[PDB]
Amino acid sequence: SQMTAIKNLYSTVEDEQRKQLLKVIIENESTNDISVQCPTYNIKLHYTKECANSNNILKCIDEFLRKTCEKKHPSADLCEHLQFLFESLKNPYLDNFKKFMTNSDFTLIKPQSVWNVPIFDIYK
Amino acid sequence: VQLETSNDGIGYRKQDVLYETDKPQTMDEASYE
Amino acid sequence: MKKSLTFLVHVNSFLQLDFFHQLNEPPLGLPRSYPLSLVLEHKFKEWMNSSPAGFYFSNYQNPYIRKDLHDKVLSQKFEPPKMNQWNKVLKSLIECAYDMYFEQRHVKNLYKYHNIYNINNKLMLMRDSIDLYKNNFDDVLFFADIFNMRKYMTATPVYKKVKDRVYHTLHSITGNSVNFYKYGIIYGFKVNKEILKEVVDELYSIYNFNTDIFTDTSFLQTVYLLFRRIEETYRTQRRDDKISVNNVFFMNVANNYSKLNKEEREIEIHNSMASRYYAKTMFAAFQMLFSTMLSNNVDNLDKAYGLSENIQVATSTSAFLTFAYVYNGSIMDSVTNSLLPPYAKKPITQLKYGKTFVFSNYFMLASKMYDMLNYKNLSLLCEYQAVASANFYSAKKVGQFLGRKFLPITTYFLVMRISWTHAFTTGQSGYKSPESFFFTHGLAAEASKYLFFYFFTNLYLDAYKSFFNRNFFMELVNGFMYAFCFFAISQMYAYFENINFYITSNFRFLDRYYGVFNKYFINYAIIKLKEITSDLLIKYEREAYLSMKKYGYLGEVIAARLSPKDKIMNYVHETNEDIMSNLRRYDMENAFKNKMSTYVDDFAFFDDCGKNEQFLNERCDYCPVIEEVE
Amino acid sequence: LVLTSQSNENLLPNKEKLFEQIVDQIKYFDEYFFASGGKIKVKKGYLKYNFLDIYKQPVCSAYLHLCSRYYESVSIYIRLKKVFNGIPAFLDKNCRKVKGEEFKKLMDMELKHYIDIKKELNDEKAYKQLMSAIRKYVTTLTKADSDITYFVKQLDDEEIERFLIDLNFFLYNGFLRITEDKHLINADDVSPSYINLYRSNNIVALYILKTQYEENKLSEYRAHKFYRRKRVSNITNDMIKKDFTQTNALTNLPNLDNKKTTEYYLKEYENFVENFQPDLHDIMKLQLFFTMAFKDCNVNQNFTETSKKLWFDLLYAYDKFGWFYIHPNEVINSINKTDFVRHVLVSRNFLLKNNDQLTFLETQVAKIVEIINLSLEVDKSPDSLDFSIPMNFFNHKNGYHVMNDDKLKLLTSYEYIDSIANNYFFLSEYKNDVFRTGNNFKLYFNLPNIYSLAYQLFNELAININVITNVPLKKYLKYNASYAYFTLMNMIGKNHDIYSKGSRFVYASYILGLVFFIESHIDIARLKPKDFFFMKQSLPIIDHVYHKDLKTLKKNCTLLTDFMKINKNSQNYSLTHTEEMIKILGLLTVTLWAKEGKKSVYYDDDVSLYRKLMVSCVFNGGETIQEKLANNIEKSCDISQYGIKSKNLKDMIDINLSIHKWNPAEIEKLAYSFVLSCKMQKLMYKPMNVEKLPLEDYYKLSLAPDMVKTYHCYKLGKQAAELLESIILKKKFVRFRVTDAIDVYDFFYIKKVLSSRIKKEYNEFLQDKRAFEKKELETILNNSPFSEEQTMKLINSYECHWFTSYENFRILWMHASSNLGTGTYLKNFFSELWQNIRFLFKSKLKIRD
């Protein structure tokens, strides 16, 4: 689990200022909450320039990411992070991602939530 | 609004369901040694 | 008052086995002994699961297993496991671990082969704690001194006059440093039910008649000062010093203990215990007793079951659905005790090993108090908490790996996770105030409505398949939801190691929480329980369950967007005792300003902000203005 | 050396003599005391005697713990007589209302027509001024303190009266005022001592003695400056040798002059009673302390004529030369300045609650130190052997100095101290109350264990050490060694803590020094069961993963033998008698840590591995067995006949010790048999290689001695471990069944030589079991030069160790099933198979006649 993952992490980590910082977390597990929370990555893009021809916004970012993995745009971070992470997720998840840059039928971008109005919030 | 996704997380793999049942709650760790 | 509590099992008897199991060398060819509180924590978990009523709930997800449960319930072949079935197992477990001390290489040389006279005083005390526990194993309860307000004493002794009872002020009651005992020191005693009842009626006859001189929290204060004077009239220079009272490990028995007679050793164990422990035990008896004599709403709380289909039968569906709740109640959830900040955290939920062993013995104290006072339903309802105390390990492991959308159990503990953040999550100088955790909010009562409609749909669908839905089922919820008053109210009794929790204005919490819930439940009895058919019973289930999955989905949403730097959440989770006490008076006083209402509009915000209208984002009940002055 | 056993006829005059020393200590009780009814009387002829020169009398030296109770109860009675008779002189000058002659008329406790002042004085302005006047005199004596002097002034007029009533009640009647809480208290507990004042709630009486009579007169907070002053200079051994030279004992070693060391300790008993000149009534009460102290003369708890002579030596050793286990200057340097408040408060509680249990212990050592003197007086001629071997295989470096002569002996240094530890375990049929401290004439032959007595005081320390933390200090007791070593210094030194001051304990400290050090630093049985699991369970070895744990034994044992040195100085080091007797008493406590039951430490099977190799390590001067034997064999023979490289020499000695239940006395016989054989196989045979062995050279193993045989029987066991691990990982439970578990052993009985291509051979075995069996024999029987009747005898004579017993059959499966014992499905599946595999061993089982 996530509890085991931080315990598996504790062998790998090599700084005592980190190991003490990880020790107090693992030691206080039964008394205190521990949750793993991801950071957001924001996909910056020109909306009207990119999403003009694509059918969906879900379809649109796929046609954006395939431009960047094959390739300076400020989404250069994300396609590094994908190839880094899919290197760690060794056999099944690297192949379908490498297959993703070929097949246009594929959508990597998929909705995690049921979408309602408005789609975008336009910042006054 | 929630959309039920396929459970494939680190805590949420099918492998992790069986692994946490493989080790029982050891009396050694609950003693804090 | 002195004869009321007889301390059966001495500390330094039981302290040797749980705190000091490393010092005990095992008998030969046999592994190292684990501490006795862990073995009584871990065999308590394995007892429920081997006991047949616990077997069905741990396998409730398999449909072919649980139909064997429902068929026994309708045919009344079901009972929850009484703790009279537990104590017989406990007598064997303690006599093992006592004999696994007596078959040690070093005790057997001194104790077995030679005559017992004038042996080392532990080795006699390690014997007499068995011989007392064997004779009275059903009455013994076990307790742990977790919270201590210890003074400072200069360590060259002062002549103590015999008549001098030092604990006569509230300045002699107060503690400079506060010492938590997290590794646990467990001892035992016996409650004489009659002689206690002949005491606490006479104290209630003093308070009720002479209200001229007492208020609620003044009389509660001054009984505890008697319970420090009786604690001091047992203290002598022969047993212990000044310093050895404050330090538990410095306690021993009289140096002439081994030479005394069997009738004289047993009176010495009672005297040697209650020099240090007469306050905490006898006040724990008095706190539950004195509050429920005051509040007029206990009779209305126990005739809820007892008229139509009482739980004393213990085979009815009324007795099933209550225990079916409490086993998934998981008394105070292992998820939520990691959630609660340290001021509102119970002292008993801080033991490093042996939580369920203390809890299952703690709540059976509260059962005997209600069995004194003829509240035989609440005498039974405290047992269920003590009987379902085994799943404290289970409530932790549910949220880790068990399937979220699969288990109704998991969706229950995820909503109750958010119920301790209910007025907290609306924050999107902390302008919000901390909500009262001693109060149980609207989500907690709705979450127990889920497990009732989860189980009673699983019961009814097997009744129409195998085999007056209006007036019976109405008397079932009138039973069931007024149990949830009591499981929410008896949290206040768990904070019995300190007096300063109870001194607040909401001392009779049992009345003012009852009226808040009775206003809530009548407003639920009128509307949703107006029309009841079989079709509606399934209809109210998945209408709730989808909302419970909706309410359960909030914690995955809100927690990812949180920031550590809130000016209030640094302040709520403080551990400085001068800050720990400013909050425990605050949530008790500011308890009932909160309401039992759940709003659907809590997270829809107004996008436009008029500066005068900036309050409409906030949406708490009690919103005091907090203004930054520089 | 077991006193009860009547087996040995050479020692029966020696055993009978030792009892009549113990019976003779009744004669010292008879000569002063008379027993009339149930009350003990002084004899009528001894009414006039002062009893101040008891230290000159022999009954003090023969009853040390009793004579020390006496001169507490006399030194208190002298000093409180000086104070209370100081009052009417001082009442005149510093009180105006009541003068001292009025004080004498008020409280003379001779019967006229209790001594409550206020009902008799009946004058309130006098009373509050009199209580003011006494408080002035008590604060007069406590001038040297600020904190105690503060605590005296806070006392009421009523609370100072109870000091004055009880001080006068003591001097008139000789015993205290225990009237409060009286169910607990016996007869001796009333009797005056520094403990029994404190338990009696007379703390003001302690305040007087703390300031003006005894040292460290400052309070506890200033005591950190005190003990740093009582640090002394280090003493050179050439200073030490000037004292030991004048006497030589029976063991032909230097000894302290015993008439000097006795004369050193008696100065503290002389200065108690130097200038006291008794009245008529004073002798009547000095008899009362003499009856209360020497009521408890007993045949069991006496000091005999040897232990008497030694107990004064170590007091003179510790006070002058600083000769405890831990050096006394080391303890005070180990304390931090803030922590001296904690260390004293442990020694207050530890000595209060255990002064009865300690004074039982210090007598109970005195029986066993008497028998250690009996050990040296055993005739050692017939069990000696005249011839000697050039490397000491059987002599122990830390044995007796008598036994350390370089000759082989039939009874080594072990079996004596193994027999002394056997003295506790031979038991009479009927139970005895040895612990009863009253007067008994009977001589109880059962003796309680000196270790299990002293372990129960370890249990009381390690409780009272855990005041300082709420964590239980389970493994971490080794770092809180200072909280014990300061309590030890208060016992064997002068007990400077007057609230818990008792008699000095030497024998209790030299045991509780070693018992605490064994049960904290180097104990292994009570550490957590996963970690160091192998040393807790004596078993054969099949993989040598465990050698990193073996170096913790050498780390622990060399820490122990550094602890057991009485003198820490090694510049000009020289053994003495008193150090030797404690070193032998040091070896006793190590043995009683190990032995359970009448069987010896080396030969028992219940006792762990770790204790068997610890006890063997302490005798060898902190060398391990595996260090001792490898150093011996490599110089005594050329092992490269047997192909054993000198790196792996220590593994083989480890490998063969593991066979015979981890027995050092067994393998020492094996190794020297190997050394005797290694010299003779070298002349008459061509060398072999046991790490790389051919099939054709298997007959070389048949002629090999018992070490190299089983060291090659390991190599089959190691190989079968690495098949059965690799077969499971290959079959991954797809093809893994019971039938593989049979066939792994079926390769294991057949295969006799380590192979390079192991998995290749096993696939050849599954195809043809019988034809592969012929392939082993046809190679050996053809290629060995011996006849095939002879060669078949050499094969059948040798048996590999894993076959002969069920446990040695077992652990090959237990090696794999522990190496794959993570998951519940992984582990209980391996619990499933082993029931089926037990059916295999019945088929193999044969009997050799």
The coarse overall form of chain D would be: elongated
Instruction: Determine the number of helices of chain A (DSSP H or I, runs of at least 4 residues).
Output: 6
For the termini of chain D, the CA-CA separation is: 40 Å
**Strand portion of chain D, in percent?**
under 5%
Short description:
Chain C has helices at 11-18, 36-50, 52-58, 63-74, 83-102, 105-110, 121-135, 193-209, 216-232, 243-246, 262-294, 299-306, 317-329, 336-339, 355-372, 376-387, 392-398, 408-419, 442-466, 471-489, 509-525, 534-552, 554-558, 569-572, 577-589; strands at 5-6, 140-144, 147-150, 177-180, 186-191. With 630 residues, chain C is mainly alpha-helical. Chain D starts with 11 loop residues before the first helix and ends in a 5-residue tail after the last helix.
Description:
This is part of a larger assembly, with two copies of chain A, one copy of chain C (about 625 residues) and one copy of chain D (about 850 residues). Chain A is mainly α. Helix content of chain A is about 50%, strand content about 0%. Chain A contains six helices and no strands. Chain C is mainly alpha-helical and about 625 residues long. The longest helix of chain C is centred in the middle third of the chain and has 33 residues, at about 260-295. Chain C starts with a strand and ends in a 41-residue tail after the last helix. Chain D is mainly α. Chain D has 40 helices and four strands.
SSE order and pairing:
The structure is cut from a larger assembly and holds two copies of chain A, one copy of chain C (630 residues) and one copy of chain D (849 residues).
Chain A: H1 2-12, H2 16-27, H3 47-50, H4 57-70, H5 76-88, H6 92-100
Chain C: E1 5-6, H1 11-18, H2 36-50, H3 52-58, H4 63-74, H5 83-102, H6 105-110, H7 121-135, E2 140-144, E3 147-150, E4 177-180, E5 186-191, H8 193-209, H9 216-232, H10 243-246, H11 262-294, H12 299-306, H13 317-329, H14 336-339, H15 355-372, H16 376-387, H17 392-398, H18 408-419, H19 442-466, H20 471-489, H21 509-525, H22 534-552, H23 554-558, H24 569-572, H25 577-589
Antiparallel strand pairs in C: 1-5, 2-5, 3-4
Chain D: H1 12-23, H2 25-32, E1 33-36, E2 39-42, H3 58-62, H4 64-84, H5 87-94, H6 100-107, H7 117-121, H8 124-141, H9 147-153, H10 157-173, H11 194-198, H12 203-212, H13 223-229, H14 237-244, E3 247-248, E4 254-255, H15 258-265, H16 267-270, H17 280-293, H18 307-321, H19 328-334, H20 340-352, H21 355-376, H22 413-422, H23 450-464, H24 482-492, H25 507-520, H26 547-563, H27 577-594, H28 609-619, H29 625-636, H30 649-657, H31 664-684, H32 698-702, H33 706-731, H34 738-750, H35 758-767, H36 769-783, H37 788-797, H38 801-804, H39 806-819, H40 824-844
